[PDB]
Amino acid sequence: KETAAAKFERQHMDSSTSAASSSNYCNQMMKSRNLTKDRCKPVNTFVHESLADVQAVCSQKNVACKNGQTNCYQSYSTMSITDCRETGSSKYPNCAYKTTQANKHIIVACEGNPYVPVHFDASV
Ligand SMILES: [Pt+2]
Ligand SMILES: [Pt+2]
Does Lyase appear among the keywords? Predict the structure, then answer.
């Protein structure tokens, strides 16, 4: 089975580029990462940074997670993310997404050894 670490990389890591190429980015990436397969995943953030820079967040500012757990970390620096958000008119199997590009702090949940992102909590 896929590790929580490996699932975080499939869902949230796009080291290819450094930002959204067009506004078809989400429609292609949500597809290529198997996020439109069972259902249309409604909201998903891709981080356009190196694995090393996103994993280092786990040594940065310790914060509460949305669920009340305290294994969350806020990045000290802003990071290049694409927010992917299903349109109101999107219907499975033809999933449609709005692509928003931004530079923001990420909050991730970390666990295991090595201590690495397992959950994308939010961008701030
Ligand atoms: Pt800031
Ligand atoms: Pt988890």
Answer: yes
What total of structural domains would you count in the chain? Answer: 1
Residues classed as catalytic: 12, 119
Q: What is the CATH number of the domain that holds 50?
A: 3.10.130.10
Domain that holds residue 59: 2-124
State the ligand closest to the CA atom of 4. 2
CA-CA distances (angstroms) from residue 3 to 46, 63, 76, 83, 85?
18, 23, 26, 23, 25
Query: What was the structure determination method?
Result: X-ray
Q: Give distance in angstroms: CA of 71 to centre of ligand 2.
A: 10
